[PDB]
Amino acid sequence: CPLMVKVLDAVRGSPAINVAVHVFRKAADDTWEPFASGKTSESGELHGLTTEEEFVEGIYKVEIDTKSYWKALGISPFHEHAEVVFTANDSGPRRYTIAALLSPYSYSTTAVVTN
Amino acid sequence: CPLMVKVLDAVRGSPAINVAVHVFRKAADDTWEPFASGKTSESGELHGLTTEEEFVEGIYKVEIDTKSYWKALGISPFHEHAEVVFTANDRRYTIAALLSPYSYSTTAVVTN
């Protein structure tokens, strides 16, 4: 699995479950084409977005729908979503984990990239 | 000054200086219209982006050119940039970003 997303909730100290994630790839004409989407599981993970074959070099945007997450918990958060944008596979295939840690007015995101 | 940006460098423990920041407002057609831009000062801050008159309710995007920052330091970064997207609803907004090569955090400090 070359692209995985892991999301944690900093208020509850738990996985962030049922978080919607939309992945896009920057096209030849410079716009963002839909690439993959899904929702985090009970462990706050999202696997199976793509395949090695499909996940070619390019600029990708991983959009994490943080607002919908907080709103469903009664919280009115600051951000609309958390967007993570990166060049992938430009030195050959790598495995990427995009981790996000969420609070209503703050988030962090870290990439763990392995070869 | 209704909107301020503060950027920090977590490798060096310092303000991130000369970091380009572009702000956009979302238009009725769902595109991002350029709104404000500048480069962070010696204190890692960018003030004077707007005025209260100009900064009406709406969805804004603040794009922080983190890639160029790291490149200038000779360090290979992960992200193309850091994007911060939020609705301005009617005080003073401080968007802060703490930068590392493969990680960043962003926090909104909203005050009167």
Add this chain to the structure above:
Amino acid sequence: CPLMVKVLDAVRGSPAINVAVHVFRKAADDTWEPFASGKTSESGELHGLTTEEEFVEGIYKVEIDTKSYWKALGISPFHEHAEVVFTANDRRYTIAALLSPYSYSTTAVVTN
């Protein structure tokens, strides 16, 4: 003002006000001697902890009473406190802390 503390609340997007902070210096016997303390202001800051004369090289601990902060808000936190331990080596040190109930980050901004 060689040592400043800044505390932020990541749930509310605000300075963390009235947060008690205790600073200690490590003594020759490896114990922590009380050094400075105060409570954060309305801007989440604590200034005037020391002077340059007093703030000699050595290992310091800054303890931030995060548990009491959350309790006062009716929120159940994880940590007993946030501890920040570092060697002062000879400028101006700003210890910043971003607080959430089950998470915190701390950053040193060291400048001239």
Add this chain to the structure above:
Amino acid sequence: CPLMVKVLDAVRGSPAINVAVHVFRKAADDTWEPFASGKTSESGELHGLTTEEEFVEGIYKVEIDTKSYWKALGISPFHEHAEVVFTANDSGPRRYTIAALLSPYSYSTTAVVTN
């Protein structure tokens, strides 16, 4: 495994490997008794510190030896170590993961607690 530690390196975007971790428990006489120790693996994880039986209620300190980590990489970091202090198991047994994300002048730590 009721207590696990996971450490990531924010400069390299990788697990933080061979990080020394020392765990202490606050004693009856108010001092910190050694409780467990170990080092993170190639995945940046440390399992097997304790057992359910041994990990009774108490105040614990997880000390992460961040300085030694950075120094071994040629970096002179700000902090001596990252200390995480918490009451454990005071509402019955829980599983705790103490995650730390490291940069030379900054770190964050998050607890994920499951029942």
